[model samples]
Target: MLKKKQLTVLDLHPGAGKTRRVLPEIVREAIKKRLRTVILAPTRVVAAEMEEALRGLPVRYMTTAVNVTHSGTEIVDLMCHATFTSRLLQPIRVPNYNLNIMDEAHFTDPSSIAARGYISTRVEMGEAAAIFMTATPPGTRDAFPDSNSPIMDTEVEVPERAWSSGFDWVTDHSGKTVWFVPSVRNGNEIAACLTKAGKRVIQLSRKTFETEFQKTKNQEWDFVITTDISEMGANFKADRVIDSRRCLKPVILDGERVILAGPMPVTHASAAQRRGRIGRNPNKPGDEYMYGGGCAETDEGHAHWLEARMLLDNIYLQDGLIASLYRPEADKVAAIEGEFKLRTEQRKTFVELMKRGDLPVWLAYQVASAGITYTDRRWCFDGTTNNTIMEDSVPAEVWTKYGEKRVLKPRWMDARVCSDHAALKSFKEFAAGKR
Candidate 1:
């Protein structure tokens, strides 16, 4: 039988100046170990809070300077494009820089462009030793098969029955419906009803933000309806996170402002994070509540079921899963040696695909320039009709009757548009009843 590891609780009384005593030592030890330490929080606000806490500890790495990386346009542009390399290198252009603190390590999923950039940048810079700090980490064992290889696993699992004791309700009233569903219409209906009730409803979605839905920063809105994108980067003082997606095991509550996380796995770090939110004041008695709600029947609530199924299948597949997800291939030549190996080439192809999916009005002509041609004009259905074509039209097929090779150089590019020379030859042979 595998031996179970012991869990130890650290008690640092606030106002006891324990953070000052403890954190500095922790930082010094990290430096001694030559580790790049990261501190991660779930929300940007939480990350900021962590930053403030760290600052109080005055735990600066004397050899390595600390910097924050997030999705602010200015910061991202600077980091991404290598624009301010001179200024960035001005301070400690020396060697052997250790210790990077990634606050909100839970957000380090590859899906997050910011997190991906941060991780990749750190790896590229050859940080000697790296440490990730987070209260809640996302994903499960199945989701991250390679978790143990790179991760130093540490956890404290609280039983489900004890959860309510750990948390309390945040809302003042009971009738306020907290529904978790994957259906967009359900949220829209709720928003509509809230608007009817004069609740100052604001409809915010990924589409809304991506499009022209930017609105007042200081303007007060009672209720905001949005997609999953809103949860990570954005924050507001709210009573609770409705967690319509049912991702997190809610632990922070008790009638005050609460962060309702979607039903998802909170990393060990995230759990610690939620607890840290409370006790901002050392002398004050504050309670942190976490609540979990879901129905298996609904689509949003189905994450648990779906995750279970995926977990089972993943267990069956073993090592094959990672390659299957990351390297599914249609073009063998492109997969190995083609320009696809380069980052710029991959981004160019991805942008073309995105244009095909989202902005077809602008992309239809561009894809045609590539090998893909539209035989049926109605293939596109993404709400763009400015350059819509006929349904019955066929792509020009190149062939010839006498097996003529119709070749055109780049100089005659326009003249060779939709040339069916090779296709026409095959067609003629077929019509003539030749084998």
Candidate 2:
């Protein structure tokens, strides 16, 4: 039974009926008790999944706030990460909800200070009970010490139903197969191969996901080619699963087929989730092809997301919470204003260089000159509790340039170059915390 201070952690695998069974059952009980409940998601896609799973139940989405029941006790409430962050930060226009069910609670902000604070702070206010549902480990473990219950599903899938080439496997396979690729361009080429073979294929990405995904309900396709977009949210049972461990970006340039980018590898957790596409619907073959692998993901099987991090080298200020903690109270505003003035001077210099036509290489020289000066250790108050966490951080930026440098040229451009393509760099990957 749900209590005022009960902090539940639902450690369940992908298809262990987390969304379908456990989630709805919890909501039904909460609603019956006239207890207000809010379901939080890491992204809109997960929130979308929540809406679908809770269909036919009394539920109201945050986006469709108009004409909906204000009281969560009357009907369940749903929201994405942004709304939850906005509400928590403002601390106004909030309801005295009885429970907060955070689905996929494994998701954390890059700021360690803010990471597990949301649920803990909400529970601290004595406003609601917090349930962190995630299959992953080290998931807000500091907040909820005891594992409420372990929901396990026997995921019996053998990678040996092997087809070396992804193209051939899809051709031979009968019913619909959800194929996960490393890059969007890989999906395109694979889709092209399937199309040439007279196979019906639907390629999905961030751009075409929702529009194309909706069509799957009405029509069936031989192959659904996608990258990480299919990993988390939208649910569909596939006859088979494939992980083409390659990141490709190839295109024509001046009548020549040139490679624009290189390949990629999958992690243990990601690979496991990909295999899980067929867990609920068994007898489905799961296949994975090998390419270049990374640190703990390959050399070691398990990778702790919180422990591993990638800080994009960019011109920006430290996080608000972090800055406030480290800087003196009187010096905070002055430091920010001083940085603003300094960057403004740099901006003027950049503008002059830009207007001078075929620009001087001073900008590149300046950036290269900046990087890697010192290692750092800072004790930060994690907002939720009085306890603090000390983080060992190297200069993610200073006296050096980091993150996605091109092999042949300075930046990724369309013009033909001399060097081989390494995988294409994306701003999205930077935001999503890539290694």
Candidate 3:
């Protein structure tokens, strides 16, 4: 199987403001379905923001279902005491829900036992249908279960044109060029330099929280230097993405005037999203400036791999490819060669899933097939295309064919295709196009 598919950070940019418009509608639809829902916002502040976003819609806490899990001290206290018998407490206690929506699902990596435990506790106890919402969900296959695909459907494209229009408004009113510095460090330094020059500059870092993050939220500055963090969820308007980095910083530079400083990971999807950033201000002139860096590594396989891994998790097959490239048994680990007790129920679920073809044949393929798998190993890609049959041994081609297709199909032939990298990519692409 191809493991997890490769995606650039730019591939994640769904224009601008699309989430704001579509997420409410999604929430409304879920409410109408009479399903209990849990929406996981990437950050507590973002979660609160979402709650506010849905405040006045037809949905109501009493009539329909809406529970915000980002708990404050008081909310946490209230949640612990609520029980099935406490009907009177229900009005002031935690709301029972049927669906879960998690923002920034990408942060959950199974290798970190804490992260895995936290996620598992939520899913197992919540007993609700879960929907993880994020431009970047965890790239690692292990974050999800071997049998469940956690990604629900996605919304439409962001409003790039509106963002671009805002950029034009800034530039035309200020009579100064708006510059986007791609490097986090450079953006910091540039913001400092611009500050010294008496020019306004905002250095937006993902590290900012609460007050600090809000300080820069929509405040205008002559220059905006940011990282890929700006690509998802954060609301900001840019005049252009001046590819300030010697290397490409995966960002959707939306606006009328853009100056590419150097090389960029302008995949077809990125090119489309970045272009959509403009025309928001139909009255403003939009310009895209691409400056080539000499002998770039944009097309190099390894470079692409690195970028893809940064944006998403490495493709699962890439792990095998790397293992083989270095040594076949490079990853072999010491294990006790002794019998261990297996709970009868554990064995039952294992056998049940296997009988249903739910076994994780390949960890990476399992992720694609099940939308979740539990393991530490990540995936990569070699893009080798071949098929073979087993004579003396399994022919390389046949094995490759079996492996590749296994990830694409469901555990059982009759299983539904709910989540996979291809599906995620298609939704992202379609969303970006709408901008």
Candidate 4:
């Protein structure tokens, strides 16, 4: 039986059927121990796959249905597959599931509202045993560190592939093929190119992909082009799989009005996932091809290649270097103030919101950018009637009255003294006492 103290992190390779094979066993074990279980995935497609895999099992399960309405009573389950967002917004009030499993757990950012809500309501409140499974454990943040979480690293020997370009590669192959493009627009473009070249091509967009896939999943086609929706766990049988390596592009975070260069570089893990699309059936052999020249000649482009090379070659380097190249810049609050001409009090409020994890970093910058100030008398979301106050703004008398009820500490304060001598002194004494 899984214990509350046992936090298991499964670092499984893509297409290993880890969830398909292992999840049922976990559910059975939990059921035998008279405990319920919940499984979480990042996307609806992945969640649907999990639900399909668990069909005909003895355990009861429920998945969020598409275009379907419910009265909130259909949540009968000992095992279930739910999207991370749905679980946060309208949580099926399980008294206490003994075990909770999160697939693609690396995507669960600590500062994300979904993660915050899940932790507060499910993990902390219910005292459930937790399991986090991911193919590529994020390099930037160790969501579940080794100290407390037991990690099971599965070894995967991915088949090698040759690189190529154009429609010739698809024609050269005999059986069904899929050209995995990076974006929906690219999928359409590639589909058109293939069609003009006299190949029967089918393109799947984000909007219509799921429904179309349901209808034509079993039927063989000359060529099928799709975006990153098929990247993670969705399996497809193909004789040849061609990758149009459309690397990361620039995107703007509207809140901060900051242009973010794509953070995820095409790593060995991603390459392996793409390659695994083919060679699924033991009866049929498959070939893999990756076409280059998608990213433009820029600093981010060079960094993307370097990151990919390091991962492919199994080279070890400092986390800081990797973070600088690939991780989104989180400490850009100072930039927000400088760029937006935020008032001192507004900046202070933003920093407090950031530190307390009350608002996401980008959101704090967004609020700052909008010149909005925060109030001290904020309602506590932790199911307490206590009016919480930011530690940065309140007087000693106010702190004494409400601090015990709910205190919002700054995230930066845990790191270093940042021009606040009084707060620094207070923290020092508090730390010393704890020690």
TM-score for each of the candidates: 0.36, 0.54, 0.38, 0.54
TM-score of 4: 0.54
* 407 Cα displacement, candidate 3 (Å): 48
Model 2, residue 2: distance off in Å is: 3.3
Please report the TM-score between candidate 3 and the true structure.
0.38
Ranking of predictions according to lDDT: 2, 4, 3, 1
What TM-score would candidate 1 get against the native? Answer: 0.36
Deviation in angstroms for 215 in model 1?
9.7
* Candidate 3 global lDDT: 0.31
lDDT of 4 at 400: 25
Between candidates 3 and 4, the one scoring higher on lDDT is 4
Best by lDDT: 2
Tens digit of per-residue lDDT, candidate 2, span 1-435: 378866777877666677778999999888788778888765565666676677767877885423344445345778865465445333246565678787755442222212234445446556468777766533111211212222122232212222236435346667776777766655777677677778888877654666788777768778788765565545664556655543333332332123334443444445545545554533433322222233122212111111111111111223321112111111211122222122334433333222221122222112222321111101111122211111132111111123432211222222112121222222112212231
lDDT of 3 by residue, 318-402 (tens): 2222101101111222212111112333323322332233222122223333332222112212222221111234321211212
Give the least accurate 10-residue stretch of model 3, judged by summed lDDT: 75-84
- Scored against the true structure, residue 21 in model 1 reaches a CA lDDT of 42
- Candidate 4 has an lDDT of 0.44
Error of 3 at 286 (Å): 2.5
RMSD of each: 17.9, 14.8, 20.5, 17.3
Range of the 10 consecutive residues with the lowest summed lDDT in candidate 2: 372-381
